[PDB]
């Protein structure tokens, strides 16, 4: 079926909007998330006009393959959306309300530069293939959008759903400049991560720093080295939660800092024993007493510095 005849040169603006249902599988490995939402389409077609008691039906349902519908295709998806038409209701006023449920594997980059405390911005791109006249998809309904009333994707906090049509193209064709952009700026709630990940590493590190309140070399070595083994094992346990992160993560900088602190603690214990064995107890005691206060303070300063360079 040919597109409805344009009465004038006015572009056939289509009213569009996605009502989110289930945003799940937010990281298959680290990147894709899947959506199973509805999208509502409204436009103007030369369908039934005002109908005062002639046919008796207001929402005249039509076959999905009968009436022409604009071709709207997602840009950043694995494959074409699994479109399943739910209800095509055409009103006598002259507008067609199209509602289809699709399950697309949306693509969006995940920026884990501040992993425990990050706030990502998922993206959905819309393009319309113009046939005879230019179609402007910039018409955002702003009334058929929104997630579920539960307001949680998979344990995430939604902040906004700004939909701005950016007059930009991927250096191709002519109608690509009219892209419709869906910005879902979600924020991760971090309460669970504080005891799940952050606190136990600090507890293990403090168990390590205990080694400065001991004059026994064997006990000090056991503390520091076995605590290093415990920290590596806990890192293995945590690593299941963390994504690939090929670049430098924030939580990948605290862990390296903790490794450096283990190395410095081993060096300090060795220096203490080395000075204590060769008839210099005063220097060993001075170094131990200095380190008792110097290690936590330097750790606090390092954490503050990392927070400043990352936030």
Ligand X SMILES: CCCCCCCC/C=C\CCCCCCCC(=O)O[C@@H](COC(=O)CCCCCCCCCCCCCCC)COP(=O)([O-])OCC[N+](C)(C)C
57-116 residues in contact with a copy of itself (CB under 8 A) are 57, 59, 61, 73, 75-80, 82, 84, 86-87, 89, 97, 99, 101, 103, 107
- Residue 74 is given by DSSP the state E
Options 5-13, 45-53, 165-173, 300-308: segment touching a copy of itself (CB under 8 A): 165-173
- The CA R_g of the chain, rounded to the nearest whole Å, is 30
Based on the shown chain and the rule CB under 8 A, indicate whether residue 198 belongs to the binding site for a copy of itself.
no
Number of residues that bind ligand X (CB under 6 A): 23
For position 155 contacting a copy of itself by CB under 8 A, the verdict is: yes
CB atoms within 10 A of CB 147: 20
Residue of 4, 45, 114, 131 interacting with a copy of itself (CB under 8 A): 131
Compute the CA torsion angle 131, 179, 137, 5 (nearest 10 deg): -10
Using alpha carbons, list the distances in angstroms from residue 186 to 19, 81, 149, 180, 219. Answer: 16, 23, 15, 19, 48
**d(C-alpha 90, C-alpha 172), whole Å:** 34
Structure tokens at 242: 């963390």
Handedness of CA 154, 34, 16, 175 (dihedral sign): positive
245 contacts a copy of itself (rule: CB under 8 A): yes
Residue 160 binding result from a copy of itself, ligand X, none, given CB thresholds of 5 to 8 Å by partner type: none
Can you count the helices (H) and strands (E) in the chain? Answer: 5, 13
Looking at residue 192, the DSSP 8-state letter turns out to be T
Window 202-241: contact mask with ligand X (x via CB under 6 A) = ----------------------------------------
Query: Cβ closer to ligand X: 86 or 293?
Result: 293
Question: Which does residue 299 bind out of ligand X, a copy of itself, none, counting CB within 5 to 8 angstroms by kind?
Answer: ligand X
Q: How far is CA 203 from CA 9, 63, 96, 198, in A?
A: 70, 64, 62, 9
Question: Could you say whether residue 162 binds a copy of itself (CB under 8 A)?
Answer: no
Our CA angle for 159, 165, 169, nearest 5°, is 125
Other Cβ atoms within 10 Å of 97 Cβ, number: 16
Q: Is 289 exposed, middle or buried (0-12, 13-18, 19+ CB in 10 A)?
A: exposed
Residues shown for the chain: 311
Q: Which does 283 bind (CB under 5 to 8 A by kind): ligand X, a copy of itself, none?
A: ligand X
> Shortest gap between Cβ of 148 and ligand X (angstroms)?
39
Q: Of residues 113-172, which lie at the interface with ligand X (CB under 6 A)?
A: none
Pick 119 or 192: Cβ nearer a copy of itself: 192
Nearest to 118 by CA among 154, 157, 151: 157
CA dihedral 197, 200, 206, 210 (to 10 degrees): -150
Q: How far is the CB of 130 from ligand X (least distance, A)?
A: 59
Residue numbers 241-300 binding ligand X by CB under 6 A: 260-261, 264, 267-268, 271, 282-283, 286-287, 289-300
Q: Among ligand X, a copy of itself, none, what does residue 252 contact (CB within 5–8 Å per kind)?
A: a copy of itself
Report the partner that residue 103 touches, choosing among a copy of itself, ligand X, none (CB closer than 5 to 8 A by kind). Answer: a copy of itself
Q: Which stretch binds a copy of itself (CB under 8 A): 1-9, 198-206, 285-293, 299-307?
A: 198-206
Q: In the complex, which residues of this chain contact ligand X (CB under 6 A)?
A: 260-261, 264, 267-268, 271, 282-283, 286-287, 289-300, 303
């Amino acid at each position: 079926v040919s597109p409805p005849p344009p009465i004038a040169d006015e572009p056939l603006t289509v009213n569009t909007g996605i009502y989110l249902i289930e945003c799940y599988s937010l990281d298959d490995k680290a990147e894709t998330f899947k959506v199973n939402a509805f999208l509502s389409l409204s436009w103007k077609d030369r369908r039934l006009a005002f109908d005062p008691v002639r046919s008796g039906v207001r929402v005249k349902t039509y076959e999905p393959e009968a009436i022409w519908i604009p071709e709207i295709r997602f840009v950043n998806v694995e494959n074409a959306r699994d479109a399943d038409v739910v209800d095509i209701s055409v009103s006598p006023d002259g507008t067609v309300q199209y509602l289809e449920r699709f399950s697309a594997r949306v693509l969006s980059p995940l920026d884990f530069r501040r992993y425990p405390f990050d706030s990502q911005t998922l993206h959905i791109y819309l393009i319309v293939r113009s046939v005879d006249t230019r179609n402007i998809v910039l018409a955002v309904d702003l009334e058929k959008v929104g997630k579920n009333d539960d307001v949680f994707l998979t344990g995430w906090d939604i902040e906004s759903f700004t939909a701005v049509v950016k007059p930009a193209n991927f250096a191709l064709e002519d109608r690509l400049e009219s892209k419709l952009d869906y910005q879902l700026r979600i924020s991760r709630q971090y309460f669970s991560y504080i005891p799940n990940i952050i606190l136990p590493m600090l507890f293990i590190l403090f168990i390590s720093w205990t080694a400065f309140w001991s004059t026994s070399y064997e006990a000090n070595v056991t503390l520091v080295v076995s605590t290093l083994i415990a920290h590596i094992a806990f890192n293995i346990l945590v690593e299941t939660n963390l994504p690939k992160t090929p670049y430098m993560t924030y939580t990948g900088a605290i862990i390296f800092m903790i490794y450096l602190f283990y190395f410095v603690a081993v060096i300090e214990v060795t220096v203490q024993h080395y000075l204590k064995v060769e008839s210099q107890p005063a220097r060993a005691a001075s170094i131990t007493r200095a380190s008792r206060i110097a290690f936590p303070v330097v750790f606090l300063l390092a954490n503050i510095i990392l927070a400043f360079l990352f936030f």
